Scaffold this active site. Structure first.
Site, short mmCIF file in Angstrom:
data_model
loop_
_atom_site.label_atom_id
_atom_site.label_comp_id
_atom_site.label_asym_id
_atom_site.label_seq_id
_atom_site.Cartn_x
_atom_site.Cartn_y
_atom_site.Cartn_z
N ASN C 155 7.89 4.20 -3.01
CA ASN C 155 7.17 3.24 -2.19
C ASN C 155 5.67 3.45 -2.35
OD1 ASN C 155 9.80 3.40 0.11
ND2 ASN C 155 9.08 1.49 -0.80
N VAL C 156 4.93 2.34 -2.31
CA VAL C 156 3.48 2.35 -2.41
C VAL C 156 2.91 1.53 -1.26
CG1 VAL C 156 1.46 1.95 -3.85
CG2 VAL C 156 3.64 2.53 -4.92
N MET C 176 3.62 5.67 7.48
CA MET C 176 4.45 5.62 6.29
C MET C 176 5.91 5.74 6.72
SD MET C 176 2.31 8.81 4.82
CE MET C 176 2.48 8.69 3.05
N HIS C 177 6.69 4.68 6.47
CA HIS C 177 8.01 4.57 7.08
C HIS C 177 9.12 5.19 6.23
CE1 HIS C 177 6.41 1.14 9.74
NE2 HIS C 177 6.70 2.17 10.52
N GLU C 219 8.31 -1.50 -6.10
CA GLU C 219 6.83 -1.60 -5.97
C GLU C 219 6.19 -2.04 -7.29
OE1 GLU C 219 7.83 -1.34 -2.77
OE2 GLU C 219 5.87 -0.50 -2.34
N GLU C 270 -9.83 -0.42 12.55
CA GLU C 270 -8.58 -1.07 12.21
C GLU C 270 -8.84 -2.56 12.05
OE1 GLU C 270 -5.82 0.71 15.42
OE2 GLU C 270 -4.88 1.31 13.52
RB LIG Z 1 3.92 -1.99 -0.75
#
Ligand SMILES: [Rb+]
Ligand SMILES: [Rb+]
Ligand SMILES: [Rb+]
Ligand SMILES: [Rb+]
Ligand SMILES: [Rb+]
Ligand SMILES: [Rb+]
Ligand SMILES: [Zn+2]
Lengths: 67, 476, 469, 470
Positions: C155-156, C176-177, C219, C270
């Site tokens: 994942n990215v 980050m999941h 990704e 944010e």
């Molecule tokens: Rb992504």
């Protein structure tokens, strides 16, 4: 050659093309619609006129009485 | 800088990259109108479009002259990339300058008095006339500045008025016009038509962009018409010249074309349909006609005409900030916390106000004030209030404020049976409004804040780096 | 048109005047951040800004790389003045392309592997780090593409990276999941968790890293889809055989999450435009730096919107929402969900029958993203460009009867990042039907719109070609 | 799991389970048969079919209220008659997508519907004991037929049939959306359009004819899916090779829509509980009648709900809506869209996060059917049976704060058949969130529910077996 808006035959030529023989402009003497000989105008039914609509058209502003 | 006529403005536009020359000959329809629509569709940096050759005609056409914030900026003599907010502040600063009386010029030195047509008047030998929209009743002059006054009293231009009114060509020397839409001519026309007398007007085409601006301005300024043009030129008077046939009527010295004539009394003929600024066709009505008694024009005149359609087009720029500055001044008289008013959307039916919030709930008070002004009361249907640091002309900034400061459970107010305008086609009942107030502002005491946040205030040197990046950008 | 790396995109940006070179030596603060804010404040045609010299640093910085619709258009290989709506259709067209598997290149073929720092690791000798916003807790890497991981599990995503030391950075590990289970197991066994932090990338790599949901490909395979079927080059990490990085990244930080360590991270800006809070967050030790010669520190400024970050979240939020709506409602023309991660959404659609505009809004308000995020939903007609806010405001002022076209629904799902929510995390939705009535909804006064003249589309291309010369 | 090959096998099971009454004495056609159907529906629960052995002036028998209870509906599915409505819903959802179950074509000699043939002097009254269903009906009506028209483009639906002559009937052509393409070409060429009208069918055949959308199989395959893999038997019609009818139909009327003929049809009742308007509609010429020996006229009474027609539209409307919601919302437990063709919907779901219940209602209100049809949408918790209206009332009285759990949205799509719509055809939707708050929604007072004692499921089975043995 009827007027595209009200279908009247009472149409006359307004002007010729100032340069060359490119086009003419016609005008309806009943409902004042005018068009060039270049364009082929289709008038939407919502914008067409008859003697009924013209006679019942809103006169803006009202013509005041004389004297 | 100041412009003495349209040609000076056109060359400035072309120099800044805001004017296109369509070298090839085009047809009158649908080419010229489709180009005006196309130029409007470019979104940003939209240029004016200049047609050198139109089939059957002898002269030129230019369109979309006012149709972008770049052209609008150059109109006021500013850098072309000037933000809309900064253009708004410059307009507000110049709005009330007085006196700047116009400079009356000898007839010979007025370029609009170069060529004279007094017999066999044919508008087609002067103007490359064309059909703007498909269902228009005829060929329209859509960007004229129409001059009226009182005959008996010249009033020293206290009664002389200039506004923009759509002009339907009815014949080679006759045009239609909307007489009731010409306020200040109502009783003058009733008297004229009661005793069967003409009413003289002058129709000027191809003008200094500030003249068209003031002509597109109907209320909001206290100065005389041409004096207001001088006020918008930062205190530089404009040149005017008496009309040929009428002593009380004065036209700008540099107009490309001047149409001197009169309203024909007791005559009503079918005018329309034609486009209107809400983006739809008007109805066909029995309106007034004007006989054209004399034409005075510059050598090789340029038919400056306007396309209008589904907004935004050029017409929206003719009604954007000249609507917003008067409303801003009315709000500011009693609410100095108001920073700016953006009333540019469908003649001010949509309004965005930026303000400092004095105390809790003050943002709805500011909206109440707008909804109680002469124009905002019947026109303004959607009113968004944002904080002082939000540019109300940057709709991307307004979207942010809507998504983070609007709790629709309490920041949104729906008020029924308020005054409205019939030109809003969604009004039900017609002519009545249900108003919508949106309080996109940050709560201040005593309004509780559900989560107080610290905004990312811009870094020091931001303004200097704007000017820095800008001078590096024009040097590419 | 596709780009091997950041440098190929940068040179195209300069060719189109969408890049400014600051040739003079600037100070790390506040110059670089102020230039990022100033570039954003230019409103339209905003350029990227490239600093050739920063006081005390060896190398260069570029900012606002994605920060305009012109730059966004060039990223997709389109003409720079392509409208946002057309960029949306282009992205939607490429979105599902499959398969475009990436090309694994040998190590000596990847430019990122040009230089290797395996000892005395000092981030400052590579990246000209600076403070982005004045109240930030430290110097931040704000535009990094972070790799975690077989290839389906790789994942990215992009995460804010606070510099804590010469070789230590902070990271929002819960943000980050795909690492939550792996991290709980790693910290329970007191083991490191390898990650790879890439800086300076192909603009479509950063775009995919800024996309957290909405695509079905892997990704790097999705990047190949965004490149219209052109695979991208990837290369194995130096220390970790399961982690692959883009071959042409400017800088690759190979490191690991230090187990059972929590230290003060933040505050930091944010995307809603305000500072986040300081929390005790995970730290990451950097075990190897891998970088090209003369690396370019591609970093992002963010602040009061719009900034560059809004462009990295605009159309990649809108395209998946459009596809979900299109499956059952083919009348939908376009979805504009670019405003604060789609809290504000504008939908253009044809109206099948009376009231259909609110049915479209109901559909968006029941999508996985639109259900908690979308608070203000505006529906406009099929001919209205929902990315043209002038046009949308026209539709509001002429098609919205607020007595019936505006619906206010309480106790709906919300997101806590919306600070106006009360109760927090709950939404009161607002639906606005800026569409023209169709039968059987009565029309108080039906008008005929000024349809554009024949030949308008051809005249747009001709005028553009005329401005080219 | 009982599969029925005709109506008789189902009527036998009904009578065996105490779900069928035999009226042995002669009845008048009107108003006895209609009043009995209305009276059977009025019984409230365990309502039985009613079978008339003798009608005045007719030779054969009439059965009514065949589908008119949840006991009769359960026996239709091959389930025990006291199977709860929720469990019948779950069974239909299980069988719904079974594929493939192609129908079995039998030879003509083996199809009971081909037992007797009448080709000349066609007289419907010598077969069907035709009667008036409601006082203001335009005439006598066939109200429960399955009309076959045309293999993938063969369609079976239920349309009301007004008897106009001894061999002529009226039909709602525009209600058969699948025939319109050929109908226009036929009328322009003055062409008959063949159809087959089957009366008295296996109960699952009538269920599929009463289903106009929501299944991907073709008509007779879908019946096979509802029979859990048992194919249903079909036979080619006598006059039209492309039309296939159920092998066990009591009566088959083969004929054709007459081109360019429009006569006044109606009024007739509709499922909203009111008479339709009398319109000029299409006529059908009956060319041949094939029927079993001693045919049984299976007709239907409809009135103020609930009557039998509500059971023919109840769960076959709910199952497709459940499937559409479940695709993106696995938390959804069941969808009850049984009330007036889904104008009222009750959904039970797990609440994923605060306010999720209103998102579930949004999804329903954006489905192809729920969008124009569903006006009142109630959402309850996962442990609430949405088909148990007492439990739904409990959720309403304890989990609905009307100041925030009730949403009223104007200017939404509607359907004209809802007579309260104003403007007609537009809806003001009502969402009621009868769910318990979950974070981040604040709970003004959280309570601990009385969770069922352990072993309740086992004791349910034990008590049922204990009851049968008494
Ligand atoms: Rb992504
Ligand atoms: Rb004026
Ligand atoms: Rb607010
Ligand atoms: Rb509307
Ligand atoms: Rb069917
Ligand atoms: Rb509730
Ligand atoms: Zn005419």
């Amino acid at each position: 050659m009827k007027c595209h808006r009200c279908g009247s035959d009472n149409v006359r030529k307004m002007v010729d093309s100032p340069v060359g023989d490119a086009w003419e402009v016609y005008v309806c003497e009943k409902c004042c619609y005018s068009w060039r000989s270049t364009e082929n105008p289709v008038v939407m039914e919502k914008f067409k006129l008859d003697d009924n609509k013209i006679a019942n058209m809103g006169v803006i502003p009202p013509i005041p009485p004389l004297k | 800088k100041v412009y003495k006529d349209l040609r000076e403005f056109l060359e400035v536009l072309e120099q800044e990259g805001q004017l296109i020359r369509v070298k090839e000959e085009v047809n009158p329809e649908p080419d010229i109108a489709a180009a005006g629509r196309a130029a409007a569709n470019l979104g940003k940096n939209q240029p004016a479009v200049f047609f050198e050759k139109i089939k059957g005609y002898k002269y030129s056409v230019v369109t979309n002259v006012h149709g972008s914030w770049q052209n609008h900026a150059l109109m006021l003599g500013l850098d072309k990339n000037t933000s809309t907010k900064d253009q708004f502040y410059e307009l507000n600063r110049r709005w009330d300058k007085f006196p700047v009386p116009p400079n009356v010029v000898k007839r010979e030195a007025a370029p609009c008095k170069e060529n004279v047509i007094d017999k066999d008047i044919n508008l087609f030998e002067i103007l490359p006339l064309y059909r703007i929209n498909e269902q228009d009743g005829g060929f329209y002059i859509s960007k004229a500045s129409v001059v009226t006054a009182d005959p008996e009293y010249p009033d020293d231009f206290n009664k002389l008025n200039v506004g923009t009114y759509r002009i339907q060509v009815k014949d080679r020397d006759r045009v239609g016009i909307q007489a009731l839409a010409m306020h200040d001519i109502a009783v003058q026309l009733e008297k004229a038509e009661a005793e069967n007398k003409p009413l003289p007007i002058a129709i000027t085409i191809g003008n200094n962009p500030l003249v068209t601006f003031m002509a597109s301005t109907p209320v909001g300024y206290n100065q005389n018409e041409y004096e207001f043009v001088g006020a918008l030129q930062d205190g530089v008077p404009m040149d005017i010249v008496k009309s040929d046939l009428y002593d009380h009527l004065y036209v700008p010295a540099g107009s490309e074309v001047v149409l001197e004539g009169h309203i024909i009394p007791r005559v009503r003929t079918v005018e329309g349909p034609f486009g209107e600024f809400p983006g739809s066709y008007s109805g066909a009505r029995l309106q007034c006609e004007v006989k054209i008694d004399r034409i005075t024009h510059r050598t090789n005149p340029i038919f400056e005409n306007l396309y209008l359609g589904i907004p935004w087009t050029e017409i929206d720029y003719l009604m954007a900030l000249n609507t917003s500055v008067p409303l801003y001044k009315q709000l500011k008289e009693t609410m100095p916390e108001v920073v700016a008013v953006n009333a540019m959307y469908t003649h001010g039916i949509g309004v965005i106000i930026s303000t400092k919030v004095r105390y809790g709930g003050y943002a709805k008070g500011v909206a109440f004030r707008l909804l109680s002004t002469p124009h905002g009361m019947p026109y303004s249907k959607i009113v968004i209030v944002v904080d002082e640091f939000v540019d109300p002309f940057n709709l991307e900034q307004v979207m942010w404020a809507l998504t983070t400061r609007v709790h629709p459970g309490k920041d949104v107010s729906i008020i029924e049976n308020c005054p409205g305008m019939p030109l809003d086609p969604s009004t039900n009942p017609p002519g009545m409004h249900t108003k919508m107030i949106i309080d996109a502002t940050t709560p201040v005491p005593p309004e509780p804040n559900p989560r107080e946040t610290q905004l990312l205030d811009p870094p020091d040197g931001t303004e200097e780096w704007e000017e820095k990046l800008k001078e590096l950008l024009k040097n590419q």
